């Protein structure tokens, strides 16, 4: 919904007791000063030069035009009360004549203007409390001045509506109306950009193949000269079977694409169009609107904290458990306990979870204890389905009733927690054998007759309400929180994992569903959200809520103990990105891989920088780089690790350039010494592909050998941080020191690796130190 009809036309306050209808202007105004020196109606009556007002039906006086009891005069500037003598009656009279000595008999000497101290008498029109006004739109005397003039012939206009560049994201906001005015346009840029992009990805002469139609619904496979459940439109062109058109959902991302009547005899001349949907963008705008317009969507505290206002610290009146460890989950460490303890006693917390530090178990533990404060279901989100699924599984281990809500387009996708999916819980409700019967008919047929269908839908809403309303926890993606099925539902406690990977409007979709306790978990030193549109990204849409809050000065609680890396590997990132604060939950002995006879340049430090001084070159694409010498050195390192005992699927090669990634896979196929399959299972990608993932061993290929600005982890500290914190057991960087050292971050890195005597040269068999 929008605001009501009787909302103050300046600030939007809509308490019936506070609003006054101007009879000429046909608009309402509250009796709060806001940021001005007088109430909003009085501001309006002076400027618009009106004198005639009416109060509101649902207010105290009922719907009464304010007028002189005696002569009917409606001029508020002449009106005031006089009281009877010794008696608690009071009438509204115009001062002259009606309220004048000779004309009267009642006490003329106690006449009191309707308009007192630049407001209507508080005891006739209520004055909005300060908390109400701090929540309203913050219009200034001057903006009213301008707005009141923009109405002299466009009465329908607002403050929001008063080209070139979009406004840049602010840190602090006057109110959520400004917040919507800033983010709203940015969200519109990403939506329009994305849509244009999707509709330009369309491809003409594609060879499709099929899977047997034994599974009822059919699959289609093809390779083009990008996510699961994305709707793709397949059209057949030619005369081997009549012109066909069908929609399918993606089930296998990549070369090969795979999408779940149709012409399964033909192979050639199909057309692929990528179907775009506004849903997530629609929902984001919706959230921004709800945030601005609905005072109940988030607590006063959270509203003011999120907008960057000064807000006094509040202790939440929750009860701490006896043991912080949740049942079903292994014991928390000192760092994680301190997080849980702290966050349960606060209305808004940020948890920073560095690589390997136990975010999910920490978040699951927090959600467990929130669940048992008993104030309805906890809402748990993450920007991505893989993160929700991971968190959903951990929460389920504690034995709470969890419902995984997902998009209707992703219901054919499997995951270890499909059995928790709402749609699957509904299917297995033996308690409603009518719904199951109607569902049998849908799945053996096309969509059902309008009577059948009304009934099915009704019972399906019932099923949904039953499961969700009784859930201890609901899990879905940030955007998924905007699902219609969760509208109409209040979430007092909300937790968002990996929030540093969503844009603010995304992250705000769930928050505006009743947040009174919000916990943002993330790491502003690892990758942030992807923003495809430069204008929007430059305007600041790439900043997350978490980040803005961190910049605002809100200090996240940091999980301090990492359990992933051998200590030598944690050392550098800890010192540079995490204030040297990371503790090692795993010892050096704990992190020698078994069946691994590899001879590190220094035996007890399993990392090194191999100097390659290859020339880079532009990939025949025209748009990237590759370094052939470096790639050669990478395969040779890959081969050594394999010979030494390492499992191929536990080797990752990270590289900033497609050209290198592409050359690197080609090279090992056509030039490795080991069997071709073995290399094929070694994952090669950008750091983006390795976010939130780990391997036993990581090789970095930096590619650049000349002076260069660079893309990727060459010039982004956050990407370097992720790059250096995927490996458990060892990491090897291959690159040109001279090229890399221009960047001060790499300079430190090289100086550190040198100081550790692990910057090396020459053949792998006889590796020596580099005297640069």
């Amino acid at each position: 919904k929008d605001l009501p009809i009787h909302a103050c036309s300046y600030c939007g306050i809509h308490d019936p007791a506070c609003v006054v209808y101007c009879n000429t202007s046909k608009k309402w105004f509250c009796n709060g000063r806001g940021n001005t020196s007088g109430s909003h109606i009085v501001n309006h009556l002076v400027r618009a030069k009106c004198k005639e007002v009416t109060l509101h039906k649902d207010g105290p006086l009922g719907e009464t035009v304010l007028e002189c009891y005696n002569c009917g005069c409606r001029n508020v500037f002449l009106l005031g009360f006089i009281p009877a003598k010794a008696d608690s009656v009071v009438v509204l009279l115009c001062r002259q004549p009606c309220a004048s000595q000779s004309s009267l008999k009642w006490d003329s000497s106690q006449w009191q203007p309707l308009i007192q101290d630049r407001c209507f008498l508080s005891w006739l029109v209520k004055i909005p409390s300060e908390q109400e006004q701090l929540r309203a739109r913050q219009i200034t005397a001057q903006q009213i001045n301008k707005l009141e003039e923009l109405w002299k012939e466009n009465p329908s206009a607002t403050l929001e509506d008063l080209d070139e560049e979009p406004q840049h994201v602010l840190l602090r906001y006057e109110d959520a109306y400004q917040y919507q005015n800033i983010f709203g346009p940015l969200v519109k840029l990403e939506a329009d950009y994305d849509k244009k992009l999707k509709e330009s990805q369309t491809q003409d002469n594609i060879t499709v193949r099929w899977d047997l139609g034994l599974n009822k619904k059919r699959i289609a496979y093809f390779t083009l000269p990008l996510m699961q459940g994305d709707e793709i439109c397949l059209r057949y062109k030619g005369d081997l079977a009549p012109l066909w058109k069908g929609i399918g959902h993606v089930i296998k991302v990549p070369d090969e694409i795979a999408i779940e009547g149709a012409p399964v005899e033909v192979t050639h001349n199909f057309q692929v169009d990528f179907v775009w949907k506004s849903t997530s963008f629609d929902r984001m705008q919706s959230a921004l609107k709800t945030f601005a317009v609905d005072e109940t969507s988030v607590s006063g505290y959270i509203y003011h904290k999120l907008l960057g206002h000064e807000v006094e610290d509040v202790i939440i009146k929750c009860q701490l458990p006896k043991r912080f460890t949740a049942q079903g989950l292994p014991d928390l460490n000192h760092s994680q306990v301190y997080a849980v303890k702290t966050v349960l006693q606060r209305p808004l917390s940020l948890i920073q979870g560095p690589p390997g530090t136990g975010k999910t178990v920490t978040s699951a533990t927090i959600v467990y204890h929130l669940a048992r404060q008993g104030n309805g279901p906890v809402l748990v989100c993450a920007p991505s389905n893989i993160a929700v699924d991971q968190l959903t599984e951990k929460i389920h281990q504690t034995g709470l009733k969890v419902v995984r809500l997902c998009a209707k387009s992703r219901e054919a996708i499997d995951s270890p927690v499909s059995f928790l999916a709402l749609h699957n819980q509904i299917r297995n409700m033996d308690s409603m054998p009518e719904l199951q019967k109607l569902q049998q008919l849908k799945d053996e047929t096309g969509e059902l007759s309008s009577a059948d269908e009304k009934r099915y839908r009704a019972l399906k809403r019932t099923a949904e309400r039953e499961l969700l309303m009784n859930a201890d926890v609901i899990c879905c993606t940030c955007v998924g929180a905007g699902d219609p099925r969760l509208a109409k539902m209040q979430f007092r406690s909300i937790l968002i994992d990996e929030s540093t990977q969503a844009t603010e409007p995304e992250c705000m979709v769930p928050v505006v569903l009743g947040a009174k306790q919000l916990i943002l978990v993330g790491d502003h030193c690892q990758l942030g959200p992807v923003v495809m549109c430069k204008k929007a990204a430059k305007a600041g849409l790439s900043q997350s809520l978490f980040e803005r809050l961190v910049v605002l000065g809100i200090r996240p609680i940091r999980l301090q103990v990492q359990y992933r890396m051998h200590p030598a590997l944690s050392a550098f990132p800890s010192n540079i990105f995490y204030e040297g604060s990371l503790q090692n939950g795993v010892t050096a002995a704990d992190r020698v891989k078994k069946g691994f006879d590899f001879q590190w340049p220094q035996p007890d430090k399993p990392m090194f920088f191999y100097v390659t001084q290859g020339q880079e070159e532009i990939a025949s694409s025209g748009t990237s780089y590759l370094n052939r010498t470096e790639a050669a050195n990478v395969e040779k390192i890959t081969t050594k690790l394999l010979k030494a005992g390492a499992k191929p699927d536990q080797i990752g090669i990270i590289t900033p350039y497609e050209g290198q990634r592409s050359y690197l896979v080609q090279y090992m196929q056509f030039s490795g010494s080991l069997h071709t399959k073995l290399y094929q299972e070694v994952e090669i990608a950008s750091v983006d592909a390795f976010q939130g993932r780990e391997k036993d061993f990581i090789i970095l290929s930096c590619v650049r050998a000349n002076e260069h600005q660079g893309i990727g982890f060459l010039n982004d500290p956050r990407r370097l941080n992720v790059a250096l914190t995927r490996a458990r057991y060892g990491v090897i960087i291959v690159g040109n020191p001279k090229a890399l050292s221009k960047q001060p971050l790499w300079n430190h890195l090289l100086n550190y690796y040198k100081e550790q005597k692990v910057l090396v040269e020459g053949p792998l068999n006889n590796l020596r130190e580099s005297l640069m």
């Binding site: 007088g38 009656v89 009071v90 509204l92 009191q112």
Partner: protein
């Protein structure tokens, strides 16, 4: 207790005073009753001069 006070707050204050001055010349709480036939009840505060005196 000024808010974000503009140069156009001064103008309004002056505009409002004049407007009242101009329109004449031509011619814890306490319950009070108000005329309207119909009566309605207003809660007058102890702050006010109508309560403060009575």
């Amino acid at each position: 207790a000024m808010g974000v006070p503009c140069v156009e707050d001064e103008d309004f204050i002056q505009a409002l005073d004049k407007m009242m001055l101009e329109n004449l010349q031509q011619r814890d709480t306490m319950p009070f009753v108000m005329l309207t036939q119909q009566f309605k009840i207003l809660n007058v505060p102890m702050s006010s001069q109508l309560a403060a005196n009575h």
